[PDB]
Amino acid sequence: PGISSVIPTVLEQSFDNSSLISVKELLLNKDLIHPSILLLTSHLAHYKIVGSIPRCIAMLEVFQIVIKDYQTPKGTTLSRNLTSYLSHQIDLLKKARPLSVTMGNAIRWLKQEISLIDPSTPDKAAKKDLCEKIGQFAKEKIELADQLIIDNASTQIEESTTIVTYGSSKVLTELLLHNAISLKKNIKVIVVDSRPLFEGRKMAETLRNAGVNVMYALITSLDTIFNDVDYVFLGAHSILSNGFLYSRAGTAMLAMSAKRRNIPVLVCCESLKFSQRVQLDSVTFNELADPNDLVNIDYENPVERRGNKGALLNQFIKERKFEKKKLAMENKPKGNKIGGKKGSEGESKDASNEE
Template structure:
């Protein structure tokens, strides 16, 4: 079998050299890579879920460090960790249920009265208590002690063989269920554009004017889906300098039959009074409902707020980041090459060679992203529906585990976890 560490190094190099760019492409490749890591991981008889979690964390820390700006990498790593915890919880719940069924069948009527079979709610509570740290809620739960129930003894050798077979079966079942859930996650990433576009007819109405900035495939599919539903509307596209991705989006929209007008970024405030809605994409959605988006969108959001125009963000659930903008591991921005703004020949003319220092008199700053605070966002449209910025915490609770929000950097733990890979 291939060396997993070599595969990790190869994938890290691709992220570091920006051979994989874009939130969707990065999320999909990360999920596929973690699926292969899980399939090749050796799981011990005890603490099977812990072994998988350690392996995924060890690999995930390297992937996140390779390209910290691509927050989708960390999102997928945490989603996979949450999947492992949920599948292990499901198997533990089923095992406890089977244990109590066997206890109830072996005991007589008197013993059943003394040791009643646990209900489904009690079984689920017992499983949660074994996997999660104690809290006030779990302390108040009335969970009967399953270990107090008498177990029938029918031969030590046969019982030991049965337990060994059950453990082996559970290991295979855990890996199989985790891989199946990761496959579902990859499928959701692939189809997020279609699921978001299905909601377009509910938000775009007849004869409206829509404003967007730059180029986003999610926005394009959203607008084109409304066009296919016989909605007639106009689109203003701000060009998105200095990379001018708005020009590309405008050509794509015209090819699909939409009435499109290209405007400069500086004309957004002048044109916003004619607009009914602003629809934009995002690079990442933070836990507080804030937005990391292409540069220039904060200006558009401020103009929309000034004229009371709804500011709508379309983004797949893989872009939802459980971190806050003030977290130290979050890099809100990166600087692109100055050549987007000024050719190298023109830039070299601004160098101070006379003094002998060679230091430039002209500095060019070319940031990639803007941060849009949640108070400027009207609505998020994801593949699970429309949500207010204040609802982001609920989605985070569904997609991520609190134990995985901050991935600790431990080189020794990484080496131990990677040693179990084959």
């Protein structure tokens, strides 16, 4: 069935809203789970590249593999043990890493498609049309929509401009690549990064591989890099019905500084990214991770030192806690780019009712 309970480090006096645990190294599991799920869960447990957008694309492709591998039993019909098997997938995904919003809208789409097709049509004729529809759904709601964000941003950005960014969002990487290569402008791109993971480093590396004028910075060094900047792009994860921006780590800090230092904040988003759940602060529902990633003196990722820190359990109160998914305040961002072109953040739920 799986491994449950027994957690590393202290239970903590402050911040105990979410699960801090799970299976990293494979020990005692059911022998029916499709290996592509087992690969993705082992990926997302220690992932450096993904941030909202690519996670769902991978989740869709894994589902496409499962359906291609799916052969309907002679006794039990298509809608019999499929939905239980999918519930086993999600529960294993939940154990590894809390799901994104876009992942939820994908699952909801798939469960709608199961109910739409009745067990009466031939099995090989069924799955052949299904994967075609998923491919068209991935075309429309991701790839073609992404291209629409690209061109919407293209008109918005002025000629010869400085941009500061954060994260490892797929949409923004392609945005900047479009700016450097296809349009050919003088774009100075500054990238910022935190401590738990080097998302910005990876983005800067890819921009260097393109050949961009890149400065690489940290949160501590912000009040020096600004005093230059014209636009700030944030890697969206979810915008709520409120209009609040639930995104990655060092996001709100940047957003605040920008608002106070005149220059606006811009956020690129997808029509699949919006949710109807609501919150107002970072404490509400957080994506907590184990302090194991924050033990080492960083530099790269694996260095293995006999340093100063080591003990978490035996130490008399030493909560070295960090968060991953935080909240930006509502008024601070100004632009949102989506499937329906444009719209300010105070108009958040004009997509949810439009469906």
